[PDB]
Every structure is written in structure tokens, then in C-alpha cells.
Amino acid sequence: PFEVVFDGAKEFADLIATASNLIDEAAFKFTEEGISMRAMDPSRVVLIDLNLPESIFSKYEVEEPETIGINMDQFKKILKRGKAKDTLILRKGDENFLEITFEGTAKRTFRLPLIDVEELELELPELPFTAKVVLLGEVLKEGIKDASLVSDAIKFIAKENEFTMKAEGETNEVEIRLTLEDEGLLDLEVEEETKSAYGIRYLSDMVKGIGKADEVILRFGNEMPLQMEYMIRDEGRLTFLLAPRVE
Amino acid sequence: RLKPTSLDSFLPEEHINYFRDLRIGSKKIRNAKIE
């Protein structure tokens, strides 16, 4: 059982909404260090991994490591009805429900039924990534936006001295090239030349929460999933793993 | 000429089954909620 408090419900709501625009249910594991949410879209094309450390919570009390399972559409419709700086409370008893309490002005409570789930294993087994790219959000966002006008896939190429986002349609082609001389590329580490490709519709959703100045980390491999990590609204780390488009 | 994939092809079978099960669990719980 546990009780957690966060000041500013709609902040917390928005935090959750961003982390979950691709998914329908997630497993939240509560430990001492903090909350780790893990999820997949039903097609199992994207893995979503969110960390919220103890620190960001007014009160944070967790007995033993516990993992609950939530219908995320259900959870969001409850968090929706969260004032701007009411305090948010999340009580978990011994029954498989979660108590969502919003306090301030008028205090209301709701009971969210959980999903039978076993303990979450918190990990992301080291995929043999061969390229690391670190770049500003503004650039990554504009790359995907631009590509979307032209295709529904985008191709990533990392070479020793350039990173390139490539999209080809029936109408035209668009390309973004970065070299270390551009302000938009902070790091480029390429153990061997690496090419892969990804669906835009997925990517578009993944980058929405990213702000123009945030550092984003990309790791991928040849015809391999993309890992994308960034810090979200000064709270914790969001990490996506996205399946590639191949052949 | 670009075929989609899922993570089933890249992640351990056990991890996949977890969210597979989680999803089944989730679809069953679609209705009815207090206060």
C-alpha cells in the first residue's frame, strides 16, 4: 500500500497525458526511489518508459515495492477533472483499487479499479545500438514535421561526421543534415555506419512533449529500434523504444 | 517497399507477454466507477 501527493494536479495530468498519447494501459511500479511507468501500444510497436523520482512529490510514502496496472484512458478521464493547483493524492489500500483524491476548494475522491498484473521488471535489455545522437528538440521536431508533409516514414542515417533525417514521397524529398558544426547537434557517436527507418505518425506523438531547448538522446542500430530519451517538463525521464520499418 | 515491425522481433518473449496480458486485462476493465 502507498500514499503519494503532488502539488498541481493539472500539471501532473499533463505530465501523464504526454507520456501516454500512444498507449491504452500501463504498469506503474512504486519503489522507494520513485515511480516507474512501463507501457506498450497494443500493436507493440512502441515501448514507453517514464520515471518520476520521490523528489517531485510533496508527500511520498511507499512500504514495499508494488506494481499496479491501469487502464490509461480511465485514469486520464479522472485526472482531467483536476484543478490548476489543487493538490493531488493517490492512495492505495489492500484492495485492488486506487484512490484518486483532489483537494482544495472542493475535495473530491474517486476509486480506480486496477488490472491484475505481476511485479514489473524495471530494465530495457541492452540492445546493441551502434549510433548515439544528441540534438536539440527544435531540430528533431522540425525534422519530423517537415518529413510528415512528404511521407509517412522517415529514414535515419548516422555516419562518422554527419547525422541525417531523410524522407521520400511521391511528391518530393526532404532532408535534414547535421554535423557537429551546427548548434543543433551536441553529440554524435557512431561505432559503425548506421541506417534505419521509422513511422512518422509514431514519431510525431513521441516528440510532442519535447520543448525547443531540451536535449534529446537518440540511440539506434541498423534496421533496429530507435531509443529516444528526454527530460519532460522538469520532472523526470521519458524514454521511448520504437520498432523500425525495414526492407 | 518499407515493411512495419513490432518489438516482438527485438524484445524477449517474456517482456512481450507481460503487456500482451496487461492489454487483455485492460480491455476487460472498460466500465463502471465510483463517486
UniProtKB/Swiss-Prot annotation, chain A:
Function of the molecule: Sliding clamp subunit that acts as a moving platform for DNA processing. Responsible for tethering the catalytic subunit of DNA polymerase and other proteins to DNA during high-speed replication.
HAMAP family from the UniProt entry: DNApol_clamp_arch
Record-linked NCBIfam families: pcna, PRK01115.1-2, PRK01115.1-4
Disulfide bridge map: none
A Pfam family this chain is assigned to: PCNA_C
GO terms of biological process kind: leading strand elongation; regulation of DNA replication
Summary of subunit composition and partner proteins: Homotrimer. The subunits circularize to form a toroid; DNA passes through its center. Replication factor C (RFC) is required to load the toroid on the DNA. Interacts with TIP.
Family matches, as InterPro entries: DNA_clamp_sf, Pr_cel_nuc_antig, Pr_cel_nuc_antig_C, Pr_cel_nuc_antig_CS, Pr_cel_nuc_antig_N
Entry keywords, A to Z: DNA replication, DNA-binding
Gene: pcn1
Protein name: DNA polymerase sliding clamp 1
Organism whose genome encodes this protein: Thermococcus kodakarensis (strain ATCC BAA-918 / JCM 12380 / KOD1)
Family: Belongs to the PCNA family.
GO molecular function terms attached to this record: DNA binding; DNA polymerase processivity factor activity; identical protein binding
Known regulation of activity: Inhibited by interaction with the PCNA inhibitor TIP.
PROSITE patterns according to UniProt: PCNA_1
UniProt-listed CDD domains: PCNA (cd00577)
Keyword DNA-binding on entry: yes
From Swiss-Prot, chain B:
UniProt motif PIP motif: location: 4-11
Domain of life: Archaea
Subunit structure: Interacts with PCNA via a non-canonical PIP (PCNA-interacting peptide) motif. Can bind both Pcn1 and Pcn2.
Function: Binds to the DNA polymerase sliding clamp (PCNA) and dissociates the PCNA trimeric ring, leading to the inhibition of PCNA-dependent activities. In vitro, inhibits the PCNA-dependent activities of DNA polymerase PolB and of flap endonuclease 1 (FEN-1).
Protein name (Swiss-Prot/TrEMBL): PCNA-inhibitor
Organism of derivation: Thermococcus kodakarensis (strain ATCC BAA-918 / JCM 12380 / KOD1) (Pyrococcus kodakaraensis (strain KOD1))
